[PDB]
RNA sequence: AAAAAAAAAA
RNA sequence: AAAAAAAAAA
RNA sequence: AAAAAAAAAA
RNA sequence: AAAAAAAAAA
RNA sequence: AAAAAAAAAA
RNA sequence: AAAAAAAAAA
RNA sequence: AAAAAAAAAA
RNA sequence: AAAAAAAAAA
RNA sequence: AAAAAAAAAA
RNA sequence: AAAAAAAAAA
RNA sequence: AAAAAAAAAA
RNA sequence: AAAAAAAAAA
RNA sequence: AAAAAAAAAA
RNA sequence: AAAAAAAAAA
């Protein structure tokens, strides 16, 4: 290979775009109390932690979570989670469930494309229900 | 395709990183005087303008400008470029002028994969010589 | 095969090298804090223990981390690794989580090749974050 | 073939470039006394004596030497390298030595691509050791 | 590829040449008057602003020319060039005229290979005309 | 090739060895008097001056040797290994000769299969003679 | 190839003609008046600048044309050609125009084979027009 | 893709 | 169409 | 690549 | 039929 | 196109 | 085996 | 790779 | 190009 | 025969 | 017919 | 990849 | 191996 | 199975 | 026969 610096021929000034889009995987966690759900908003996901405070929308594409903390004595982790959205809430409460007491409980859902429209920080993402104490998301999206 | 959210079925809790990596095309300007050379600093790249402020290194690739205000009466447009290194500086000028007096002059060169380490705030990337005021670098990098 | 000594029909003196290069997997390990940033020293892989004191530089190419002692009650391993470079530090912060309470957490970077050059024993390779109080490194090297 | 001139029709003003590269192998030749290593300048590179007295930096990819002068009575020749960079210098010591003793010695050592940096004359690119007064140097290097 | 030093098996003393030749493209600029043919000295290809002061000779292969400055009013830019050479000069008069006013005017002339002797600081290359005040040269010569 | 770091999905914890085995190449020089056989030491092996004082034995896979220094006047330079073995020395007198007055002498052996166990720094390798004053080994072998 | 002269066996004394014929593009510029058509004379071809004062014929087969100064306040170039000859002249008015204000307008015809007979000096080419105070031609054509 | 100069390689 | 960074997938 | 003009060649 | 110069062409 | 003499070459 | 210089040849 | 001398083998 | 040791990889 | 740099080219 | 040791060979 | 229920399609 | 975002390329 | 380092080999 | 959703399967 070229061991030195070599000219390029530059040749009209291109497009151009300070600021562009940004494909992402966000991993935060949030704070459960058992038997009440809690709504995730979607202003978690701007932050200077992720690199994401310069952008005021975003556009989810799916959600993953796990229980992150152990479960209570005698139990197996479980985490619900029901989508939201600005068109029309649904009532799935999609689950998952541990089968070892010492591990994670884990389940996601996609959003379909026709229901990918941006969000902003005082929207809501889902509803999470769990029987720990903390939960551990990862959401795939597009900021914009 | 699919209308409706779906389930999808999670596994372990992934490998993650909030602070991602980030390969770009930054577009900048800076103000030149005749007959002096201007040293760019890499400071310029880090900035909430280019949602980059988060970052304290970059990598750089390749540096391309172009003349961005008119010339002098009587003369075309002309702008060199000379690569500088921490290791020790080049005395390459590398140079494109216009053949009409109405466009820009350009010219670029290429970071060879064996000088391509960080560079900081303090650090510098190249000489800019000009017979216009301005002059638009846009910059290929990789923020780390 | 031969059971008995043989002649070799030996030529001219060979080129020789009393003290050669040495590719090779460290482990070692770290104390950590909760809450802080351990900055792991180069220095640490130079030893009477490792066959490496005669060594006074090492080119790194990569690096794993596993927790090595139990995480606090209630909570799962984790283990977080920031690369460090004498031309710019980097800021990812890669990590790993365990989905057992018993198991450990683990995460890895590798090195790219425009930054593979020498670092000595003041250097620093990393900065490393666990709940754990201890974390295992094995780090790929080449000595010279 | 045209036996006179003949005319080119040239198109627009091309990129150019005053001051370029030069790949080169540069023989000189230093002075050793026994049993002391002598540490080799990189500013021994620039000279009008080899036409590169207008650079100011260099990039080595490998170093040949030879004994320059007859050995001590009863002695073969030998010269030996060791490797320095300012990232960490090495500890191998390449070495060749004489089978006939009124032949010279020789040996040498190849950088590799993620240790070929600048350097400027205050560096150095190797220590020289031999039993001979004077070692004869050929340096394939990279001016820019 | 290889990440460390390694030993290079050299052999006998090599042929080598510490000042060698060297093949060029030189851009330099030449102030012309109206109606007046300028005679373009060899002398101006030797100059430290080329690397090119420890040379006393050169071979040409190649002349091209453009108009640097703007034409007068109302005109288009036009340059011709007149091929010199100590055994004979030329009377071929090769032009080139801009097709828009505001672009510059360029023509070349090749040398054939039983007209490619040296040429000395003394001697002229060509004769240049043109109804613009300065035209750019870009020379094709090997240096020896 | 990628010019940033990026992760590695490490997984279980590996099975590891801080302190390898280490295949070798090894140099030195004895001194000889005139119709006298040296005993070779295997103690002669480990040393920091080959990064190889942490071993404490090694498997010799073949011995080599040149003459070190010139003949008496008139002579031809001689070497003569005979292998020596905890279980049973040999009476092989492996012998080079040179044919140029100016030129070392060498010879070798090779140890089969069936006698390649350890020896420790008190056993012996083999015993040399010459009419030089020293000798130079250089000793394939397999440090444990 | 041959270095040195060598002998031609040549034969009987060769048919000979000490003044050909020959194929020529020639360059010339006439002025021309607004709204005034201008009649090109043949005697312009005959001339010392184009070493063809030594003809007393020519024998045509195109001719194209260009603008040569710039076109008035707020108009486009164009220019106008009508063929005459000897036998009767023609009525076409070939035209072209520019589509940027600052570009040459040309235009051009070519005679065909039933058409290209000898003129002489007092013989006229064409007749042309433009908005534009002088119009280049090039005629390319067989003097003999 | 081919050619010249410098450098390197099997 | 190939290469690199982030993402997702069989 | 083909054609005209001048040169040269097998 | 191929080369060089001047022209012209797809 | 082949042979001899002098040169050069892979 | 190819090329240049001189010779000779079909 | 093949031949001789000593040994071993299917 | 093949075999050993250490490293790395699919 | 392939790779780097400087030049030239279709 | 293949292998080890010693010698010789292309 | 195949099957059942609901929906849709050529 | 394929798809999307940023980058670079023929 | 491929690559780097050290070793050995045809 | 192919596509979506709920179930089942190798
Ligand atoms: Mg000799
Ligand atoms: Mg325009």
Redesign the interface.
């Given at each position: 290979?070229?061991?030195?610096?070599?000219?390029?021929?530059?040749?009209?000034?291109?497009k151009?775009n300070?600021?562009?889009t940004?494909v992402?995987?966000?991993?935060f966690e949030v704070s459960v109390q058992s038997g009440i759900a809690f709504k995730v908003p979607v202003g978690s996901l701007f932050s200077?932690?992720?690199?994401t405070?310069?952008?005021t929308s975003v556009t989810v594409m799916?959600v993953?979570?796990?229980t992150?903390?152990?479960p209570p004595v005698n139990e197996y982790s479980f985490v619900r989670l029901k989508?939201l959205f600005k068109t029309g809430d649904?009532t799935?409460e999609?689950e998952?469930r541990a089968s070892?007491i010492?591990?994670?409980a884990?389940?996601?859902?996609?959003?379909?494309?026709?229901?990918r429209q941006n969000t902003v920080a005082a929207d809501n993402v889902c509803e999470v229900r769990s029987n720990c104490r903390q939960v551990?998301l990862?959401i795939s999206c597009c900021f914009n």
């Open positions: 290979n070229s061991n030195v610096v070599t000219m390029i021929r530059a040749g009209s000034y291109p151009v300070p600021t562009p940004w992402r995987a966000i991993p200077a932690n992720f690199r405070d310069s952008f799916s993953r979570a796990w992150q903390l152990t989508p649904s799935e999609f998952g070892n010492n591990t994670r884990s389940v996601g859902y996609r959003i379909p494309t026709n229901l551990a990862v």
